[PDB]
C-alpha cells in the first residue's frame, strides 16, 4: 500500500549499496492512531531489504530507553546502527509520500560507508560539538527531504549531533509557539530559527 513496484525499483537499488545493519527502532503508543499508522509504514519499510530491521518497544514501558533517545514527540522512531547504538538520527511524524527520501538517506548513511566526500567537508563535520537539529517539514515540501538528509548525514558520522525530522502538521501548537510559517524550517538547540533551503557548508557553518 506504501510502497508502489515503481518506488521499490528505485529504492531497491539504494539498498542494494547497504553493507552494514541497520534498526529501525519505533516507540509505539498503540492508543493513537499515527503510532499504528508509523507501525505499517515502518513495516513495510523495512521489507525492503534484509539488512533493515523494524523493532517495535510499547510507549512507556523502557524509561530508561526512552531517556537514551529522548523520546519526546510522537509518533517516534529512531535509527540504530549494527553494533546497536543511537545514531543521533529520529523522525518526529511519518515520513511517508515525499519524506521517504529522507528515511532512505538516513538508511543508506547509516548503513553504509556514504558517498565520498571532500575532505574539507569530512573534518569540518568531525569537528563539531554536542548539537541537537530539529528539521520541520511538511509531506508535501518538495525541497525538505534534501535539508532532512543534509543534517541527518551530520548526525552519522558526528556521535554527538542529533538531527529529528519533524513533521510540523502534526504539532500545530508548537507551529504557533516558535512561529513556523515556512517550511523547511531549522532550530539549533532552541536559540537559532533557520528558515528556507540550504546546502552541506550552510548547515555546517550553522551547527559550528
Known amino acids: ?106 538508511v543508506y548513511n547509516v548503513g553504509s560507508e556514504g558517498q565520498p566526500l571532500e575532505a574539507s567537508l569530512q573534518k569540518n563535520i568531525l569537528a563539531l560539538p554536542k548539537r541537537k537539529i530539529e528539521i520541520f517539514v511538511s509531506l508535501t515540501c518538495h525541497f525538505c527531504p534534501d535539508v532532512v538528509a543534509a543534517a541527518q548525514r551530520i548526525a552519522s558520522i558526528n556521535p554527538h549531533v542529533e538531527a529529528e525530522m519533524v513533521d510540523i502538521s502534526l504539532f500545530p501548537e508548537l507551529k504557533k509557539e516558535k512561529k513556523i510559517m515556512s517550511v523547511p524550517a531549522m532550530l539549533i538547540d532552541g536559540e537559532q530559527m533557520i528558515f528556507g533551503s540550504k546546502t552541506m557548508t550552510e548547515i555546517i557553518e550553522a551547527l559550528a
Open 1 to 106: 500500500q506504501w510502497f508502489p513496484e515503481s518506488m521499490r525499483q528505485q529504492l531497491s537499488g539504494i539498498f542494494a549499496k547497504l553493507t552494514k545493519k541497520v534498526t529501525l527502532l519505533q516507540f509505539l503508543d498503540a492508543s493513537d492512531e499515527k503510532s499504528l499508522e508509523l507501525q505499517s509504514f515502518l513495516t513495510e519499510f523495512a521489507s525492503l531489504d534484509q539488512k533493515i530491521t523494524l523493532e517495535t518497544i510499547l510507549k512507556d514501558t523502557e524509561p530508561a530507553k526512552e531517556l537514551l533517545y529522548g523520546i519526546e514527540k510522537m509518533p517516534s522512531v529512531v535509527l540504530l546502527d549494527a553494533a546497536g547504538n543511537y545514531t543521533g538520527i529520529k523522525f518526529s511524524g511519518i515520513p511517508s509520500g515525499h519524506e521517504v527520501n529522507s528515511l532512505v538517506l538516513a
